Design a protein around this nucleic acid. Sequence first.
RNA 1: GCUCGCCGGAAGACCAAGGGUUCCUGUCCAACGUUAAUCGGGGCAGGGUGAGUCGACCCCUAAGGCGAGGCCGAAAGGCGUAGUCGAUGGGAAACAGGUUAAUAUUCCUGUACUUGGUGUUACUGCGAAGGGGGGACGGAGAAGGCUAUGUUGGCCGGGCGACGGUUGUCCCGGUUUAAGCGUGUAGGCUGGUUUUCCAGGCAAAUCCGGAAAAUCAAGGCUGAGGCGUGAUGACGAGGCACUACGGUGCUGAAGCAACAAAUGCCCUGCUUCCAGGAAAAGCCUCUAAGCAUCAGGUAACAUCAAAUCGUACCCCAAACCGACACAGGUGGUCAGGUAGAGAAUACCAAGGCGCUUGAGAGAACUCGGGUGAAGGAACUAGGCAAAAUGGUGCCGUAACUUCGGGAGAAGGCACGCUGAUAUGUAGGUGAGGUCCCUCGCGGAUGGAGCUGAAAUCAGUCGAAGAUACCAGCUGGCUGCAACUGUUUAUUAAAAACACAGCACUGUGCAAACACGAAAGUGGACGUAUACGGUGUGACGCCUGCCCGGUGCCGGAAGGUUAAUU
RNA 2: AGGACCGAACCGACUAAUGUUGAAAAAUUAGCGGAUGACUUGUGGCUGGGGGUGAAAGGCCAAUCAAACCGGGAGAUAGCU
Lengths: 93, 271, 46
Amino acid sequence: MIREERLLKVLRAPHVSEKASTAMEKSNTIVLKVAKDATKAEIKAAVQKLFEVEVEVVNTLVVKGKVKRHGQRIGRRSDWKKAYVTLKEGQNL
Amino acid sequence: AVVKCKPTSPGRRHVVKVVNPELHKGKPFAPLLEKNSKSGGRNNNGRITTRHIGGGHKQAYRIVDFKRNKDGIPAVVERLEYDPNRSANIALVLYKDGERRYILAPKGLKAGDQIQSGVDAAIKPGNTLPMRNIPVGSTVHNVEMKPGKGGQLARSAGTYVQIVARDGAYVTLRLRSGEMRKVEADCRATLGEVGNAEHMLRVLGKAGAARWRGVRPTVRGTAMNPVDHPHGGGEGRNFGKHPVTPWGVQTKGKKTRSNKRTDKFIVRRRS
Amino acid sequence: MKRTFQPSVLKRNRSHGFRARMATKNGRQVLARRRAKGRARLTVSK
RNA sequence: GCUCGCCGGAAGACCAAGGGUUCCUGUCCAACGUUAAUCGGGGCAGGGUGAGUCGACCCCUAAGGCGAGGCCGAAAGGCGUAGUCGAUGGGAAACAGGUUAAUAUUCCUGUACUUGGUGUUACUGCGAAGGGGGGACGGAGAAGGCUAUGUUGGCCGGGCGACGGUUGUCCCGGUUUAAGCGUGUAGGCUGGUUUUCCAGGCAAAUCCGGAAAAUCAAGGCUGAGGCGUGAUGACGAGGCACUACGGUGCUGAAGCAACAAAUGCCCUGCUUCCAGGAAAAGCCUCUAAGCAUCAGGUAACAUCAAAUCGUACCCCAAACCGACACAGGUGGUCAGGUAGAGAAUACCAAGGCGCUUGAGAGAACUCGGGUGAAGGAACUAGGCAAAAUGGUGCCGUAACUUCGGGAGAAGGCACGCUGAUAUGUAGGUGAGGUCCCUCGCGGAUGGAGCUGAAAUCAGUCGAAGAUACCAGCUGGCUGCAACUGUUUAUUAAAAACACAGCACUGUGCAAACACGAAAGUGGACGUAUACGGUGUGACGCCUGCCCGGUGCCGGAAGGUUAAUU
RNA sequence: AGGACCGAACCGACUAAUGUUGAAAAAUUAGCGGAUGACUUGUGGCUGGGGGUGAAAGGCCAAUCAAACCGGGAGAUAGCU
Ligand SMILES: [Mg+2]
Ligand SMILES: [Mg+2]
Ligand SMILES: [Mg+2]
Ligand SMILES: [Mg+2]
Ligand SMILES: [Mg+2]
Ligand SMILES: [Mg+2]
Ligand SMILES: [Mg+2]
Ligand SMILES: [Mg+2]
Ligand SMILES: [Mg+2]
Ligand SMILES: [Mg+2]
Ligand SMILES: [Mg+2]
Ligand SMILES: [Mg+2]
Ligand SMILES: [Mg+2]
Ligand SMILES: [Mg+2]
Ligand SMILES: [Mg+2]
Ligand SMILES: [Mg+2]
Ligand SMILES: [Mg+2]
Ligand SMILES: [Mg+2]
Ligand SMILES: [Mg+2]
Ligand SMILES: [Mg+2]
Ligand SMILES: [Mg+2]
Ligand SMILES: [Mg+2]
Ligand SMILES: [Mg+2]
Ligand SMILES: [Mg+2]
Ligand SMILES: [Mg+2]
Ligand SMILES: [Mg+2]
Ligand SMILES: [Mg+2]
Ligand SMILES: [Mg+2]
Ligand SMILES: [Mg+2]
Ligand SMILES: [Mg+2]
Ligand SMILES: [Mg+2]
Ligand SMILES: [Mg+2]
Ligand SMILES: [Mg+2]
Ligand SMILES: [Mg+2]
Ligand SMILES: [Mg+2]
Ligand SMILES: [Mg+2]
Ligand SMILES: [Mg+2]
Ligand SMILES: [Mg+2]
Ligand SMILES: [Mg+2]
Ligand SMILES: [Mg+2]
Ligand SMILES: [Mg+2]
Ligand SMILES: [Mg+2]
Ligand SMILES: [Mg+2]
Ligand SMILES: [Mg+2]
Ligand SMILES: [Mg+2]
Ligand SMILES: [Mg+2]
Ligand SMILES: [Mg+2]
Ligand SMILES: [Mg+2]
Ligand SMILES: [Mg+2]
Ligand SMILES: [Mg+2]
Ligand SMILES: [Mg+2]
Ligand SMILES: [Mg+2]
Ligand SMILES: [Mg+2]
């Protein structure tokens, strides 16, 4: 069983976008920014415990950071993970 | 038999092929097969140490029994097979206990023939005995040089060795090169000579046929530049030199044997 | 025309990568020289 | 937006490599873009990549790498055993439809499948680092059976025509549906079963191998496709209603048959040839040590798990390799119509583009093309270039020859369209009906319907019927090299190199020889009908004399002669 | 059957013209040779500089080859400009 502090650290932020809102309203799926090293089971348990909802399944992808320029100096944004978390058609967090 | 090819193309005009109708058509015996990949004539440093080798057809190694040390148990020939690894043919024999083995096929051996090994074997082609028990004057093949080591002399197609004399612990042999040699009388030999004696009558006919056997072209030393070969150079065709190997050693008549350890067994050189 | 550089990542790493430089004494000397020079990118891995 | 033009075995659509945000939206036009720019692969901001089944990872190995001890080497290090890595190869499992501005075999709907862990129940000899089987393999050729796919008819919806005609043998559009599950077919292979025994498979084995009996002859394995179900579903021409003009919502007919047909599948098959065609694991089976109403194995059911990483976009290219938005290079897959032998070629479909400076003018001259009086190689180093020939069927074809060739030698005739033979022939395909039986995806008969050359005769149009594109110039004498090949990447493709064949010569196996201070390795898991070197260069007729010189081989009496003493 | 024949893909490079501060540091156009083989091609591997590899041209070994490239000896030496 995953310890409580790990769960308290895996989730970082809800993700707001047109696709995220559409997913929420049409599929009962929320989109979160999670820790880069969080696994699907960890994310599932964390959403079960912290938001006290019931999750059906988690889908996960890694977003690669963009290369930018800040006054003739190139930089890179960090990669991050996002999770599509599907709830069990009755929760509506 | 020896078959000449009709000249329906310039690459077929001079082809002479040796075809044996009684060779097995099917697949070889799988338990006695084994992989051997090619080398290109390169050693473990990866350098060409023997020129003119490379390519050719893929081949599988047949494990041939050169020891013939399964004494006292008769065997019967099942079939004759083609072997890409050697010029002779091989025979698949089946012992009375159910073991199968490959042997060099002696001349005259057919499917259904009986062979046997050991000191009590009959004097018939295909049987193996120590050269102590073989009558003087017999022609044998697959001759051992150290007892128990396995046959090493007269293994090519059509070759044989004649037992010339016996003297105590040694017999004197007449090898195909004409050299007279001594070996211990406990070394084994197989009676009769190796079959497929028509092997030398074949004509390849084209360059490609040589390429199929893994032989790459030979460039004459006289066609090179002086930096590449001692024979190179010249405006036009010029030689003016004593012929040598690519490494500078005389190549017409100069002798290269130097082995004092085995000199005691050479009764007479081939000459 | 076919040019001389025909890229391939696996070959690049196997030939000039960090673990190739570390496998021999002369490769380790290459790495030591590059560290002393102060290079930001030590091998082709980065 | 309408018209025009170009590609269409690509200039369309996918995958791999490689690149890395170039993808989509909003906004800006300084610089970048060979011009302008409101546009962009440009700047700025935001968004976008969803997997038990696809790939990697993972299990297994090839070439090869590394390599405990080890062997060897001044040191550094070299080689290599046990091992351990290494794909370009072997190994479990998913399809159809819908949806986003941008992802989808990943999301949603429907229907599936695989492996493993737990638990219950019912039976039960389980057990490997070992044995055996299997995996497991070449080139070419020939069909037969199919499908993808196409064409036509039927069916359904719509139409009745800007200019003569068009209610019909008329025009336009659609007529689609997967994995899985059941059946086990065309066809391929193989005799089956039961006992007893055994110098074999390092030990054992009930497994494999071998031997001897008895008995029965049909049993087993593999297998495209079809058919049934999946599916009363989905999709579906179109119609109706909005539109904030991009699109959104609703509804929804027919959804069949015949013929033709692959380079795809059966087929890792079959036939044949010589040049004789991976490995290991997964998988099945056998036992050893061992365990012993335990563990373990088999089956059913229930339940749980299938993690992690990739996924956008380009990908014959403006995003990769060429300094460029560069007429260059880049592996694999898909493969419609008409004509055609064809993946050639012409015109088109799906789809995609007009190549990021234009506007005029209509000199010389340059480039790429068209035609040319009379002549016809007079040109020129040279017929260089151009012109010309060019298809299919049939007739016919010389010297010479190694009897195969030469030969497509040379040369000649026919060729469009319409009608008849024959309302569509020879042929191919094949329904209904009828009759049998081991009864089925069966056998025989039967011929409806569909498709369909080639030929002959007659007529007919033009200057011309292989009408376009496409598509041999031919003959004679001679040098050289036998031939097919190879070569100076980027001024030389040849008479040069190679070659099969020939000869000499070395080499007896711990071979000669080569790489290597060495250990070793190649030669070769080969053994003188073999292997190395050298020259010559198919084949035919041949290959003469010289051993003084220089080499090499043999000899060993004498002369001379090193270290040593 | 065939290092057989004609001919696309594919692999080459015989002729001519153009181009020659090129569209291109070797191409384009029209013709041309092989096209089941001594073929061609993808991926990975091995051979290292007096060394490799070479159907042999002193060819090729990263647009470099009668001895690669990079660093060092090194400010080599230069009766020469
Ligand atoms: Mg899911
Ligand atoms: Mg994922
Ligand atoms: Mg040789
Ligand atoms: Mg030769
Ligand atoms: Mg030369
Ligand atoms: Mg010399
Ligand atoms: Mg001369
Ligand atoms: Mg002379
Ligand atoms: Mg066109
Ligand atoms: Mg950018
Ligand atoms: Mg864009
Ligand atoms: Mg402006
Ligand atoms: Mg501008
Ligand atoms: Mg942009
Ligand atoms: Mg290995
Ligand atoms: Mg090693
Ligand atoms: Mg060690
Ligand atoms: Mg492994
Ligand atoms: Mg692979
Ligand atoms: Mg897309
Ligand atoms: Mg069909
Ligand atoms: Mg994509
Ligand atoms: Mg441009
Ligand atoms: Mg380009
Ligand atoms: Mg290519
Ligand atoms: Mg075309
Ligand atoms: Mg003009
Ligand atoms: Mg002109
Ligand atoms: Mg003209
Ligand atoms: Mg004229
Ligand atoms: Mg005229
Ligand atoms: Mg004339
Ligand atoms: Mg003249
Ligand atoms: Mg003149
Ligand atoms: Mg000409
Ligand atoms: Mg012309
Ligand atoms: Mg002359
Ligand atoms: Mg020639
Ligand atoms: Mg030629
Ligand atoms: Mg050249
Ligand atoms: Mg050896
Ligand atoms: Mg010659
Ligand atoms: Mg002579
Ligand atoms: Mg040919
Ligand atoms: Mg040239
Ligand atoms: Mg061309
Ligand atoms: Mg030819
Ligand atoms: Mg051809
Ligand atoms: Mg020269
Ligand atoms: Mg170069
Ligand atoms: Mg030098
Ligand atoms: Mg100095
Ligand atoms: Mg100086």
